[PDB]
Amino acid sequence: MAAVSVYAPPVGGFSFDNCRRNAVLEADFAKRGYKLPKVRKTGTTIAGVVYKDGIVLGADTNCSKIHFISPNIYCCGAGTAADTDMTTQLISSNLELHSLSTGRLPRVVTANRMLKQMLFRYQGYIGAALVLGGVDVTGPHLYSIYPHGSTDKLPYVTMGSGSLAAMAVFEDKFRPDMEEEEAKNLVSEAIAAGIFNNIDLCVISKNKLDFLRPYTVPNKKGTRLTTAVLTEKITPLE
């Protein structure tokens, strides 16, 4: 149409309009009790351990909190729901581009770097606290990235509401080099101790994963899972 008020071409990214408007509007509404919409949070217990030849990642459930980042890397998220979703999707597509160029299946440190530098870029304003974990040619790696851009490479880690009970269970019963069943039971038990007042489980194992064949794109599927009336008007269409 050619707007008269446009001199330079628009760019992409976050918009930052509505910022001052929302500040004034939220101060005004809070002085009247009007309850603007809020963001969805996903605070639930997420936990992970490294066993001898893999990791086990676990979460509470009715939802699915264990994200996909790579055929060898998976992620659990706590914090703002939209933030964990978008964060993991962006890093998953970046790791697809990386692997599709390199022809190698990704590295967990690459995902950790991407996540921590993206979360550092947005100065804690993206509320994604993650439990990253995967398996490369280097071995099983478990990380815990925090919304401000700080990671922590760990043997076991827990986040969410029951994180203290689950961390207590891990400090009680975690041993280096467990079996797949032992580690699976430990992660389930830590989650359960974190919920009581189902449980998802992701198992990435070194001997279920070939790091010598060329990388090929995986196939993906999807997620997200009286009184009487008086009809004043009716209007069928078509």
Partner 1 sequence: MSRGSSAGFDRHITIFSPEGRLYQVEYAFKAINQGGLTSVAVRGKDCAVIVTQKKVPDKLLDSSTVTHLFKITENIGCVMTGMTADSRSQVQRARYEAANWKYKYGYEIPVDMLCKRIADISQVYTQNAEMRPLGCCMILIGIDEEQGPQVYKCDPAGYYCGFKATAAGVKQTESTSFLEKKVKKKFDWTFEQTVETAITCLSTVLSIDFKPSEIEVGVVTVENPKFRILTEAEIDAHLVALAER
Partner 2 sequence: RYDSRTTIFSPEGRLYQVEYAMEAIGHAGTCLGILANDGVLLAAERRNIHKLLDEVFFSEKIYKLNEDMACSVAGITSDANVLTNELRLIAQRYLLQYQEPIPCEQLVTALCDIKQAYTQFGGKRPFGVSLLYIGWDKHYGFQLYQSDPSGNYGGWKATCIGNNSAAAVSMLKQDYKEGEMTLKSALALAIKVLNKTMDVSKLSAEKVEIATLTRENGKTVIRVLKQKEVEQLIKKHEEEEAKAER
Partner 3 sequence: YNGGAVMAMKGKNCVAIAADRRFGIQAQMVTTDFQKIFPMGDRLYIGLAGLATDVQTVAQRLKFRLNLYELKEGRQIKPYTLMSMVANLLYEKRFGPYYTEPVIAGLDPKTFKPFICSLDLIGCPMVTDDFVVSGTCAEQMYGMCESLWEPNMDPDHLFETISQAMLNAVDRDAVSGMGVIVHIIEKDKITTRTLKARMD
What residues make contact with partner 3 under the rule CB under 8 A?
13-19, 21-22, 25, 29, 32, 34-40, 80-82, 85-86, 125, 222, 224-238
Question: Which of these ranges, 1-9, 42-50, 145-153, 191-199, lies near partner 2 under the rule CB under 8 A?
Answer: 1-9
Q: Compare residues 65 and 98 and give the one whose CB is closer to partner 1.
A: 98
**Residue 95 beta carbon to partner 1: minimum distance, rounded to whole angstroms:** 10
Beta strands in 52-138 (DSSP E): 54-60, 66-68, 73-79, 128-136
Task: Report the distance separating Cα 20 and Cα 205, nearest Å.
Answer: 49
Q: How many CB atoms lie within 10 A of CB 148?
A: 14
How many residues bind partner 2 (CB under 8 A)? The answer is 3
- Choose between 1 and 11: whose C-beta lies nearer to partner 2: 1
**10, amino acid identity:** P
Pairwise CA distance, residues 133 & 142, whole Å? 4
Q: State how far the Cα of 124 lies from the Cα of 122, in Å rounded to an integer.
A: 6
CB of 77 to partner 3, least distance (A): 11
Residues marked as catalytic: 44
Q: Of these partners, partner 3, partner 1, partner 2, none, which one is at the site of residue 2 (CB under 5 to 8 Å by kind)?
A: partner 2
Q: Is 105 left (phi over 0), alpha (psi -120 to 50) or beta?
A: beta
- Taking residues 75 to 114 in sequence order and writing x for each that binds partner 1 by CB under 8 A, - otherwise, the string is -----------------------x--xx-x--x-xx-xxx
Residue 129 tokens read as: 């606290």
Q: Which two tokens stand for residue 225?
A: 């899972």
**Residue 117 in contact with partner 1, rule: CB under 8 A:** yes
Q: How far is the CB of 102 from partner 1 (least distance, A)?
A: 6
Nearer to partner 2, 6 or 24 (CB): 6
Residue the block writes with tokens 């880690």: 157
Going from the C-alpha of 161 to that of each of 134, 192, 197, the distances in angstroms are 23, 12, 11
Q: Does 1 bind partner 2 (CB under 8 A)?
A: yes
Binding site for partner 1 (CB under 8 A): 98, 101-102, 104, 107, 109-110, 112-114, 117, 137-138, 211-212
